[PDB]
Design a protein around this ligand. Structure first.
Ligand SMILES: OC[C@H]1O[C@H](O[C@H]2[C@H](O)[C@@H](O)[C@H](OCCCCCCC3CCCCC3)O[C@@H]2CO)[C@H](O)[C@@H](O)[C@@H]1O
Ligand SMILES: *C(=O)C1=CN=C(C(=O)O)CS[C@H]1c1cn2c(n1)COCC2
Length: 265
């Protein structure tokens, strides 16, 4: 494989799109690789990790319980509700909703959770309170995936998303049990976790959340490392490419291969 930066460039040339990426040490925040790291990209479903960070902050403050059952109605459901559509009668706990949102990308679950944290404006205010001055959520599922050219709504930057994830997972803004919970939900991702493990060498850790949107938008927020350890945060976003989903996936995998082959930098 080429060096990671060279492989990112090659992926732009091949996709005829913009790629944004950060590779960051989880423990220290050292940035090892930046590429378009201050440019804006649609978050798509990757926002669900930050959402459940906000939920966990309310639990730590005594303002929420993961056990609290939320009842909802069929009229409330949006497209792709694989878990939530099964619990119209019996409801779901706040923690079950976060599991569904992060591990299955259940969109109704995400919207029910958004309603608990004050909507998109509430989530954006949470971000500002933990010192993320860039990321913004403006819409609900599924309209937030629209990825219009030039539109700043529902965007992050690779650098801001990585810093925000590190804050949630490691900075003691969240309680110890809450940090462990957030991590475990990412470990349990069903959408891409197993697929990623199928192509990772033995010994590599993965935890992740993925997203997709219009005009080729694609993204992943991940924890990765050798020796079965979550050593680095890797954030990769793609936008404005006509490529097939399979080719976008293959280019992100190729960046992954470059990082693995050149890990000690
Ligand atoms: O010498 C290093 C390794 O080189 C190869 O591993 C290959 C592997 O066979 C391939 O499947 C993967 O593709 C890349 C898989 C990565 C999937 C994307 C993951 C990313 C996306 C961004 C967020 C973090 C995770 O590349 C590695 C590195 O060449 C050998 O198969 C393996 O025995 C050896 O230990
Ligand atoms: C999250 O990224 C996300 C993106 N895109 C759409 C869409 O393209 O219509 C809908 S919401 C949400 C989503 C939908 N699914 C997943 N994530 C996971 O795969 C199954 C369907």
């Amino acid at each position: 494989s080429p060096q990671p930066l060279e492989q990112i460039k090659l992926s732009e040339s091949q996709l005829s799109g913009r790629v944004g990426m950060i590779e960051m040490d989880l423990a220290s925040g050292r940035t090892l690789t930046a590429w378009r790291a201050d440019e804006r990209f649609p978050m798509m479903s990757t926002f669900k990790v930050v959402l459940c960070g906000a939920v966990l902050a309310r639990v730590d403050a005594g303002d929420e319980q993961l056990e609290r059952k939320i009842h909802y109605r069929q009229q409330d459901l949006v497209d792709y509700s694989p878990v939530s559509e099964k619990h119209l009668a019996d409801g779901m706990t706040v923690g079950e909703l976060c599991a569904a949102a992060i591990t299955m990308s259940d969109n109704s679950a995400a919207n029910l959770l958004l309603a608990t944290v004050g909507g998109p404006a509430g989530l954006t205010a949470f971000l500002r309170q933990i010192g993320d001055n860039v990321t913004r959520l403006d819409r609900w599922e599924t309209e937030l995936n629209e990825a219009l050219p030039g539109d700043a709504r529902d965007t992050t930057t690779p650098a801001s998303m990585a810093a925000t994830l590190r804050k949630l997972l490691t900075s003691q803004r969240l309680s110890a049990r809450s940090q462990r919970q957030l991590l475990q939900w990412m470990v349990d991702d069903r959408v891409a976790g197993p697929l990623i493990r199928s192509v990772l060498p033995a010994g590599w850790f993965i935890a992740d959340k993925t997203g997709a949107g219009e005009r080729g938008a694609r993204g992943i927020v991940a924890l990765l490392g050798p020796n079965n350890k979550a050593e680095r945060i890797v954030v990769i976003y793609l936008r404005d490419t006509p490529a097939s989903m399979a080719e976008r996936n293959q280019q992100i995998a190729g960046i992954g291969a470059a990082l693995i082959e050149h890990w000690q930098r």
